[PDB]
Design a protein around this nucleic acid. Structure first.
Ligand SMILES: [Mg+2]
Ligand SMILES: [Mg+2]
Ligand SMILES: [Mg+2]
Ligand SMILES: [Mg+2]
Ligand SMILES: [Mg+2]
Ligand SMILES: [Mg+2]
Ligand SMILES: [Mg+2]
Ligand SMILES: [Mg+2]
Ligand SMILES: [Mg+2]
Ligand SMILES: [Mg+2]
Ligand SMILES: [Mg+2]
Ligand SMILES: [Mg+2]
Ligand SMILES: [Mg+2]
Ligand SMILES: [Mg+2]
Ligand SMILES: [Mg+2]
Ligand SMILES: [Mg+2]
Ligand SMILES: [Mg+2]
Ligand SMILES: [Mg+2]
Ligand SMILES: [Mg+2]
Ligand SMILES: [Mg+2]
Ligand SMILES: [Mg+2]
Ligand SMILES: [Mg+2]
Ligand SMILES: [Mg+2]
Ligand SMILES: [Mg+2]
Ligand SMILES: [Mg+2]
Ligand SMILES: [Mg+2]
Ligand SMILES: [Mg+2]
Ligand SMILES: [N+]
Ligand SMILES: [N+]
Length: 387
RNA sequence: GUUUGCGCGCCAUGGGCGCGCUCUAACGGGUGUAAGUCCCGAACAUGCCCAGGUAGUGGGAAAUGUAUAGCCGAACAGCAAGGGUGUCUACUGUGAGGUGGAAUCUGAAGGAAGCUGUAAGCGAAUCUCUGGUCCGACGGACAGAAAUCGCAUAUAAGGCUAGGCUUCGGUGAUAAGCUGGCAAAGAACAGUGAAGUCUAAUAACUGAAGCAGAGUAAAUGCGGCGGAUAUAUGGAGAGAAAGAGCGUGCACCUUAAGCGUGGAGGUCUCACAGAGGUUAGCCUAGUAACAACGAACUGUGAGAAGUCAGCCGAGCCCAUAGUAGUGAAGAAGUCUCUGUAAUGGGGAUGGAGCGAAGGGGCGAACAAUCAUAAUGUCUCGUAUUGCAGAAAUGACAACAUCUGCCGUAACCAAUCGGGUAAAAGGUGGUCAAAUCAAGCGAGACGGAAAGGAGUUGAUUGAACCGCCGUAUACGGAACCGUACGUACGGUGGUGUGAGAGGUCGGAAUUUCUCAAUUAAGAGAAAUUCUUCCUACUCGAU
DNA sequence: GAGAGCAGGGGCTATGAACCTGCTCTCATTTCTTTTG
């Protein structure tokens, strides 16, 4: 019956729509995602019969569009009921779940008083699992042998099937967390487990590693998995800290995520980048919206204002280098309100770009108000608006 | 399409090789056959230091100037022949046009071999040693090339900017260079500063190594080797060594804005004829040119402005033109020494030739594209086999798993000693399974289906970035530039900007027609995209 | 304006780094050219 639910016209159309919304690469067949509608209209009976009589290929990284499409169909039918059996503190590749929820729940549990963190990471996941125990776990849940044959055929050969099957594999780890009596959140093969004591956390860590290497079959990494205080814990891009009052543990953008944002911002504000500065401002704005929307549940106000000053400095260097020329620099400085003596003095200091864009007449002519009216969004103001 | 940028000729105020005349170290001495060379003797004025941040006097150590004949002339100021304008005014031509004034810009990095006065800088054979800088292409530094070696270099080597931490801590002056947060180069100013050399005197009153970070790039950095170095490159030691100015000779050699002179091809104007249109009369264009409207085209003569930008282009065609110009002070040809990566340079004969300019066509060659008997396998059996689950009975008291401590200072955060599967404990018993057995696979082992392991031609190469060698000139030695400076030779790299006009060609959309007044079928008017052309207007070099 | 420091808090991973407040403090520039992306 579950292959009849896979091979039902609504599900096939939704898998097609999700594939053409993804707009992924073609694969080994080379077929376009725009070609998928024609090939469905000309092989609907062929695809459905080749799947129902178990003769289908899983042709083998990017999957082929027909392979990714059938993977989508099985994933849309198997993300429910598996989602019904899942735990509450699992947040990765699930509907209505994200990293923000994980950080909120981790903060609430640490604020209960579970200071010591057990970091457990699963290493090289779909390589490490054997297919038979995974697929008899799926068989414990799914009773239709056609689904078992097609899913195993996809495993012996990313797309939405793979994180679902991974979350099925790690739901046993979550189940034994609930059985053991432990507080945790898990996104997707990265889980932090929160207990109260160092002896407790070491014992929990070794018991978990023994469980995963024995019962689950996966092998955990000795390098990435560790025990740590929340000051030393990163999780889904978030660092952590303790507020000086004891009321809250509070989320912090980790230094790696801050460095990622700074790298993308320094790319988007290159001086020699030949696009117009309105385009750089627009791309910078979109990057700022994405990063602030990810980290608005963290505490980064000093970081936001320092990054604002950095962005404005780099944009002033961009504008000054686009003027390029001492008469052009003097003309625009006089236009923006600098007197001609200071404007000529600064404009014939056009080389030393960083120095003159740091201070003085360039800071007055290219002001924060004028950059705001130019189109630049402050990190601080958008951050205060978001939370 | 970047003031100018073409051919040919002339001319040094440019450079060589000679001849002369004069001058050469503040002012004097010496030393000496011989002094511009080597040595010796003052003052004044700055630089620096006697400091506490200054002045003002007293003092003093190195350094510089007055103060070598002389050179040069700022990114210094002024003058300035000329050039441009779609600005304005006059005159003259029938017109294309021309000439003269004002106004404004310009007078440039390549010949008025522009002119005048500076600031600053420089300023003497040769040898030896040494510092710094530059070069050994281009190319993120491969490939290709005639074109250094090794290493490293974009989740950014490296340099630089502002702080922090840990250790330490007084001689200074000359002085090329280095750096000032980076595309590259210069000039300016500031801070430093290599190599050595020189000094380490006097007296007072009134900053270094490192260390991790942060920020900042149109990318080269370090070391070796070889070479260059008159911005008269910083110095040290030798050196009785040359340097400068003026004049004058050489069938001396060269030069893009100087002087003279040529401008085809296209474009435009006028006058005659023919061809036309319209009312013997008048016109022949315009829309940038092609195209299309239009009667507006064709000859002949007379004139006017005017050329002159490498990118695949040897060579041939048109016309100035076999003309200007060069050639007998000796051409072409031939022979012979040779050089480069390539372009060349001598000689000896020979006796006359050689031979331009702008713009269009055609085009060899080159580059890019375009065309011309197993395994395995489908379906059978054979023995197995991977991973679920349930359970007749045995073996035993240990197996997991979750909660973080002990004492002491009269009172604990290894705050004080010890430990971290440390106390005290909870929680669930722990496996071994005879038997039975799911679904999906995996290999074997055989038996039959099948199945098999260049030529030639066409299109395109629109434009652009350069680098390198020689010659020849400049800004500003080098480096960067002057259209890749230009000319001639070599080499890589990028790829077809916008508007407007045409093609209104090909394909799509709206509406008609055919099909049958049926189609996501075909044709047509319009529209859009698109192939292609046009410096016509910009933009880029 | 961009960039620093200080304190100035408290609690815990306690003689450190986290954050969010302030003060409080500096740095002010070649009055010139040239050439390609
Ligand atoms: Mg004398
Ligand atoms: Mg005497
Ligand atoms: Mg000149
Ligand atoms: Mg000149
Ligand atoms: Mg003078
Ligand atoms: Mg002088
Ligand atoms: Mg000198
Ligand atoms: Mg070179
Ligand atoms: Mg290079
Ligand atoms: Mg760096
Ligand atoms: Mg000197
Ligand atoms: Mg530079
Ligand atoms: Mg200089
Ligand atoms: Mg030499
Ligand atoms: Mg000197
Ligand atoms: Mg010339
Ligand atoms: Mg004429
Ligand atoms: Mg001309
Ligand atoms: Mg030409
Ligand atoms: Mg061309
Ligand atoms: Mg060509
Ligand atoms: Mg021309
Ligand atoms: Mg062709
Ligand atoms: Mg010079
Ligand atoms: Mg040079
Ligand atoms: Mg050059
Ligand atoms: Mg140039
Ligand atoms: N020109
Ligand atoms: N060029």
């Amino acid at each position: 019956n579950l292959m009849e639910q896979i091979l039902s016209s609504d599900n096939l159309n939704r898998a097609y729509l999700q594939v053409v919304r993804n707009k992924g690469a073609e694969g080994v067949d080379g077929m376009k995602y725009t070609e998928l509608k024609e090939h469905l209209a000309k092989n609907g009976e062929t695809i459905k019969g080749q799947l129902r009589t178990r003769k289908y290929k899983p042709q083998p990284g990017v999957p082929t569009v027909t392979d990714r499409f059938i993977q989508q169909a099985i994933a849309q039918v198997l993300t429910p009921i598996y989602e019904e059996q899942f735990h509450d503190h699992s947040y990765g590749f699930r509907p209505n779940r994200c990293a923000q929820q994980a950080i909120l729940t981790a903060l609430n549990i640490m604020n209960d008083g579970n200071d010591w963190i057990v970091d457990i990471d699963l290493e090289k996941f779909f390589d490490t699992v054997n297919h038979d125990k995974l697929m008899t776990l799926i068989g414990r849940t799914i009773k239709d042998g056609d689904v078992i044959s097609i899913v195993r055929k996809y495993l012996v050969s990313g797309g939405n099937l793979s994180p679902l099957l991974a979350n099925i594999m790690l739901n046993e780890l979550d189940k034994e967390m609930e059985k053991r009596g432990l507080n945790f959140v898990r996104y997707a093969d990265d889980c932090i487990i929160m207990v109260g004591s160092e002896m407790s956390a070491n014992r929990v860590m070794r018991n978990i590693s023994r469980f995963i290497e024995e019962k689950l079959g996966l092998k955990v990494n000795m390098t990435k998995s560790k025990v740590d205080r929340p000051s030393g814990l990163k999780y889904l891009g978030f660092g952590f800290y303790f507020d000086p009052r004891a009321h809250q543990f509070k989320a912090k953008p980790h230094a790696k995520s801050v460095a990622k944002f700074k790298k993308r911002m320094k790319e988007l504000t290159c001086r020699s980048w030949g696009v117009s500065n309105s385009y750089k401002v627009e791309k910078l704005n979109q990057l700022i919206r994405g990063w602030i929307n990810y980290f608005k549940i963290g505490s980064m106000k000093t970081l936001c204002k320092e990054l604002d000053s950095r962005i404005r400095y780099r944009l002033r260097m961009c504008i000054w280098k686009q003027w390029k020329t001492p008469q052009n620099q003097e003309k625009n400085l006089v236009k923006l309100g600098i007197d001609r003596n200071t404007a000529r003095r600064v404009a014939y200091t056009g080389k030393r770009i960083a120095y003159v864009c740091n201070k003085g007449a360039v800071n007055v002519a290219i002001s924060n108000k004028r950059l705001a009216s130019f189109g630049l969004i402050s990190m601080l103001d958008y951050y205060i608006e978001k939370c």
